[PDB]
Every structure is written in C-alpha cells, then in structure tokens.
Design a protein around this ligand. Structure first.
Ligand code: GNP
Ligand code: MG
Length: 166
C-alpha cells in the first residue's frame, strides 16, 4: 500500500511525541519522556485510501542533529511543531524549516505548521502570528492539543494530503 513517511520536528517539549501517541494510541502522555528517535507505523484509511503512516518522532535535543538529519532526509512530509505557550519554540521553527529545506534540497517540501498545546490558557504565541508565518512559508497552519485530541488527526491528515498533491 501507499506509505507516507511523516516526520515530526520541533523544539524539545512542544509535544511532538504526545501528538504522535495521541494519533497512534488515542491517549495523552502526561509523562516526562524525552525522545531520542522513535518510529510508529499504523495502517489507516484516509479519504478512502488504505495507506501506511510511517511517523518519525524526532528529538528536540540539539545533540541529535545528526540523527535528525539522517531521518529528515527520508521524510516526505514534516510536522513543524511549536507550543503556543512557548515563544522560543515558535522562534525555533524557522531553524527547523531551513534545516528541512537543506537536507531535502527543496524549497517546497510538504509541511504543516503545528501550534500545539492550544488547550492551555497561558498563550504567548498569537494565532495571527503563527498563521502569518505559515502563510509566508506557503504551508497550512493547524492548532492542536494532544491533551484534548483537538486537531491531531487534522494535522497529520492535512500533511498526507499535501504529499498527494505534491
Ligand atoms: N497541556 C498540554 N500538554 C501537552 C500537550 N502536548 C504535550 N504536552 C506535555 O508537554 C510535555 C512534553 O511532551 P512531549 O510529547 O514529550 O514533547 P516532545 O516535543 O516530544 N519532547 P522531546 O523533543 O524531548 O521528545 C509533556 O509533559 C506532555 O504531557 C498538549 O497538547 N497540551
Ligand atoms: Mg518526544
């Protein structure tokens, strides 16, 4: 079947793993559990097409840029995740996107800007700012909460749809 290699990237602690585990295992991981490098494979039906989501959950730690560079190279689409309560992670987004473009040798890689932890009331990144950033990237912006599952399927499925029309 069609396989979509999705890569989740972003600063440490923004909820990359929580988003992935919510998608694959339908539960919120309320646990401190830093990722080194984890792969998830799930058979899903998306818009009637049986496909295999191969999700690459990367580390936010800078000490694993080498492991990120290797598995960013093979990814077809990228979830660039920041936390709406963490302004620094929103600023780090530009660094992750530039790194994706260099390893992919491409200015138009399938990507979704993900503003995670939107359940939190102490927002520091206005939705308008992140939407403008996504607009200048030419990529969709989707706010998610791995806690409430809001937007989780939307973020991943939108990325798959970008890969189809790429
Ligand atoms: N309130 C709330 N907390 C969240 C959300 N997503 C993740 N978290 C919390 O944020 C913390 C970090 O989550 P985690 O998924 O491990 O983030 P990460 O980006 O994978 N970190 P790393 O880069 O080290 O792997 C955890 O305590 C987790 O429960 C969310 O949508 N809402
Ligand atoms: Mg993680």
């Amino acid at each position: 079947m069609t396989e979509y290699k999705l890569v989740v990237v972003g600063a440490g602690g923004v909820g990359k793993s929580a988003l992935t585990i919510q998608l694959i295992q339908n539960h919120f991981v309320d646990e401190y559990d830093p990722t080194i490098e984890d792969s998830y494979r799930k058979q899903v039906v998306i818009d009637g097409e049986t496909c295999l989501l191969d999700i690459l959950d990367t580390a936010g730690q800078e000490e694993y840029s080498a492991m990120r560079d290797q598995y960013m190279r093979t990814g077809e689409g990228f979830l660039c995740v920041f936390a709406i309560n963490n302004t620094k992670s929103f600023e780090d987004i530009h660094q992750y996107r530039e790194q994706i473009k260099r390893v992919k040798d491409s200015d138009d890689v399938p990507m979704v800007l993900v503003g995670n932890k939107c359940d939190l009331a102490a927002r520091t990144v206005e939705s308008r700012q992140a939407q403008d950033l996504a607009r200048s990237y030419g990529i969709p912006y989707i706010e998610t909460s791995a806690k409430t599952r809001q937007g989780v399927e939307d973020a991943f499925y939108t990325l798959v749809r970008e890969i189809r029309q790429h």
